[PDB]
Amino acid sequence: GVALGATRVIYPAGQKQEQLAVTNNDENSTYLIQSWVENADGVKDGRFIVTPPLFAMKGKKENTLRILDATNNQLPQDRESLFWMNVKAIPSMDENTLQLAIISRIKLYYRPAKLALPPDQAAEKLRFRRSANSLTLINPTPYYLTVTELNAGTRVLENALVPPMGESTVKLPSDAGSNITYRTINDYGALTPKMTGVME
Amino acid sequence: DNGCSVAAESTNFIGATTPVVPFRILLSPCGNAVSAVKVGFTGVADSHNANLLALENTVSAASGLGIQLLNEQQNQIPLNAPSSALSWTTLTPGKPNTLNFYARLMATQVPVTAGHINATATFTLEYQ
Amino acid sequence: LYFNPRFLADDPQAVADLSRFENGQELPPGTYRVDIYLNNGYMATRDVTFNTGDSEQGIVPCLTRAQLASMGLNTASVAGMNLLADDACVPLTTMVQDATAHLDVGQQRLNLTIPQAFMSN
C-alpha cells in the first residue's frame, strides 16, 4: 500500500521545488501513482506543478515527487495561499468485484517571504467571537491555522481551518462552558500546546 | 512526518438490497503525528440514484442494480460528497487505524437483469 | 500486470500509458524536472523531455548538441554531430561508443556518461 512522507508541504517563496516522498510497502503489489495539485476551489490552476504526474511503482519502493512553483510571483504576498496536493494510488487487478483506488490529499501552503509575523507566533493570535449557539474563530495572521482539540468547557467542538486574515464558524452546544481551549497542527504536522481562548 | 500507508480491501459480490458485505481500509503504519482524516468515496453515480455507485456497462453486464456503500454503523455513505459535507475521523497517532465499511447491491429497476457485476471507486483521505 | 482502465478515465493517453505500464514500464514519455549528472558530476536541474526509445526503460532523453557541449562534450570529436539541427535530439549512446544514459525514475536523476576521449577538458 502507498503512504506519503508528509501530511503537509510548506512551500517557501523563491524555492525552485519542494519534494514529497511516495512509498509502497508491499513487495507483492504494483501501483500507478497519479498526482496533481488543486487550488482552494478544487481547480487545477497550474500555479503549482507536480512531476512526474503519472508513473508506476513495483514492490517495496520509494519515489520522490517534485512540486514546482509556477506562480510567476503572482499570488498574494501578505498571506499564505492554500493548495491541495493529491496523490492517487491505483492498484493492479488479478468475477463480481468492487475495486478501490486511494487518494491521499494534503495541504500545500505557498508562504511568501518577509511575512511580518513569524510562523511560531501565529497560534497565539487566534481570537474568538461567541454567540448563543455558534463560535467564530478569528485569524489575524498570514498563516492558515488548523485548529483542533477545540473545547468549550467540556464540550468538544468541530475542527476548523481558519484562513489567514479570515474567520471560521463552528456549532456550539447551548450548555457549553465559557472556558475555551484549543491546539493547532503546526508546520510539521504536530500538535501545538493547549492554549486558552481569548475573546475578540 | 509520514502519513498512513493505505491498503484497501476489495469486495466480492426497487430499493431491494443484497446482504451487506464488510470490507476494511487499513491505515498502517501511520506516522507518530497523525491526528484526523476526512474520508470519502467518489465515483460514477448510478443514473437512477446519485448515492449509488454505477456498475460498469458491458455486453455481459448486469443492470437495474447499483452499489450502495455503508459506514460501520450501516448508514449510507454519500457518494461524491464535498469536503464541506464530511466529518473528521479521529486517528490513533503512530498506530494502525482500521476503517470499516460495507457494500451491498440495491435494485434501481425491476426486473433486474443478470450479468457480471463490476465497479470501481476512489476513497480519498484528506489529512488534517 | 493489469490495471482497470476506468481508474485512468481522465488520462486521455490511457490506452498508450496502460499498455506501457502493463508491460513493466515505470515512466511514460513526457517532460520532467530532473537532476542531470555527467560522469558522476552534477551539471544542472531542469526540464528534460523524454521520448519513447530503444532503451531498457522504454524512454530516452532529448539532449541537443548545444546542451551536450555546455556539459563539456567536444562536439567536433563526434562524427556527424555537426550535421544535426540545433534543436535535434542527439542520439548520444549510438553516436558515441560506450556513452550511456540512464534515468533513475524514483529520484528523477539522469545519469550520463561520456568517455573522456570525447570531452573538451
Side-chain angles (χ1 to χ4, degrees), chain A, chain B residues 1-56 58-128, chain C residues 1-5 7-55 57-96 98-121:
Chain A
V2 171
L4 307 182
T7 66
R8 65 256 292 114
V9 176
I10 306 305
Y11 198 114
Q15 297 281 4
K16 302 306 176 182
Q17 68 172 52
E18 288 290 344
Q19 289 178 357
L20 178 64
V22 180
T23 302
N24 178 20
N25 68 351
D26 185 347
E27 58 190 339
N28 300 324
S29 290
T30 295
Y31 299 85
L32 305 185
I33 306 298
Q34 178 190 46
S35 310
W36 69 96
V37 176
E38 299 175 356
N39 66 21
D41 289 1
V43 175
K44 299 191 296 308
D45 63 3
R47 289 295 194 192
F48 283 90
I49 297 300
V50 190
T51 174
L54 186 67
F55 61 89
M57 295 183 73
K58 176 188 68 180
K60 280 190 163 72
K61 195 179 191 309
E62 179 197 306
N63 282 45
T64 299
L65 295 167
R66 294 169 193 240
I67 303 167
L68 312 176
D69 175 5
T71 65
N72 289 124
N73 294 322
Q74 301 178 346
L75 292 179
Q77 294 295 303
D78 66 342
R79 70 190 62 199
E80 285 186 328
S81 288
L82 167 69
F83 294 84
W84 295 101
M85 176 67 167
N86 298 267
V87 180
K88 194 169 170 173
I90 297 159
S92 71
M93 168 68 76
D94 296 0
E95 60 190 51
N96 307 337
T97 60
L98 161 66
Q99 188 167 43
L100 305 172
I102 302 295
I103 292 171
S104 301
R105 175 172 163 99
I106 64 174
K107 290 151 174 170
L108 166 62
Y109 291 137
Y110 174 75
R111 183 169 289 181
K114 301 286 194 172
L115 293 172
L117 187 81
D120 66 312
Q121 288 164 41
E124 182 278 325
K125 302 297 182 201
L126 187 70
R127 291 292 181 271
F128 292 85
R129 190 186 303 132
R130 186 170 182 154
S131 73
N133 278 102
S134 76
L135 182 62
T136 297
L137 285 61
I138 301 159
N139 176 7
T141 83
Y143 306 97
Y144 272 89
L145 287 180
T146 299
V147 178
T148 190
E149 298 194 27
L150 177 60
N151 290 257
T154 61
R155 290 291 203 164
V156 180
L157 311 180
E158 293 162 286
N159 294 146
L161 177 61
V162 197
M165 318 300 184
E167 310 182 3
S168 202
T169 298
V170 299
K171 292 289 205 296
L172 182 70
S174 304
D175 57 41
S178 64
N179 177 221
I180 297 171
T181 68
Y182 68 95
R183 307 176 74 169
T184 70
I185 298 297
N186 68 16
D187 284 355
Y188 315 104
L191 291 160
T192 58
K194 188 203 291 180
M195 297 167 158
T196 297
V198 178
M199 166 182 54
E200 171 190 53
Chain B
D1 187 25
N2 297 300
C4 296
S5 186
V6 182
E9 203 178 3
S10 60
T11 300
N12 202 246
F13 264 127
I14 288 203
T17 52
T18 55
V20 301
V21 181
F23 71 92
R24 74 173 63 87
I25 303 187
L26 178 58
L27 281 45
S28 182
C30 287
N32 283 0
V34 298
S35 53
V37 282
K38 279 193 174 174
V39 308
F41 289 86
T42 53
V44 179
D46 180 275
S47 58
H48 310 94
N49 194 328
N51 278 319
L52 295 186
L53 189 62
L55 295 187
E56 294 176 358
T58 72
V59 50
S60 301
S63 58
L65 284 177
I67 291 164
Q68 193 182 36
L69 300 172
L70 307 171
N71 63 21
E72 186 167 358
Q73 294 71 220
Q74 297 191 42
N75 293 141
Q76 177 182 263
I77 287 174
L79 191 64
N80 299 317
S83 304
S84 53
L86 298 181
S87 292
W88 287 99
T89 296
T90 292
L91 296 179
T92 304
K95 302 298 190 184
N97 285 277
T98 317
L99 307 180
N100 295 312
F101 304 92
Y102 295 99
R104 60 178 177 189
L105 299 162
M106 172 181 291
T108 51
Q109 285 174 151
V110 283
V112 173
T113 71
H116 299 93
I117 293 170
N118 292 118
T120 56
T122 300
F123 181 73
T124 299
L125 304 82
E126 178 186 302
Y127 289 81
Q128 186 174 217
Chain C
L1 260 191
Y2 170 84
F3 300 96
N4 190 321
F7 284 133
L8 286 182
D10 56 355
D11 169 21
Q13 293 77 49
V15 173
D17 289 340
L18 285 167
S19 184
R20 287 186 284 264
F21 289 137
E22 291 171 349
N23 277 252
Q25 192 158 320
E26 272 186 289
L27 188 67
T31 296
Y32 305 115
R33 182 62 52 84
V34 300
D35 299 321
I36 306 176
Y37 285 75
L38 173 60
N39 294 342
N40 296 144
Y42 172 72
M43 295 291 104
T45 300
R46 62 173 172 86
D47 285 2
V48 175
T49 297
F50 288 76
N51 311 294
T52 296
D54 307 329
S55 163
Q57 46 199 174
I59 62 174
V60 296
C62 181
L63 302 163
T64 66
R65 180 180 49 234
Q67 286 165 350
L68 290 171
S70 79
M71 307 194 307
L73 181 66
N74 178 17
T75 63
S77 76
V78 185
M81 199 165 288
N82 67 327
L83 304 185
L84 298 173
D86 281 355
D87 288 349
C89 306
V90 173
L92 178 56
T93 63
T94 40
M95 289 187 71
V96 179
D98 299 348
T100 66
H102 177 72
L103 178 67
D104 185 294
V105 176
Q107 286 301 295
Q108 298 282 285
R109 175 171 157 151
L110 173 65
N111 297 309
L112 309 175
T113 72
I114 295 176
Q116 190 57 34
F118 297 97
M119 302 294 295
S120 58
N121 294 142

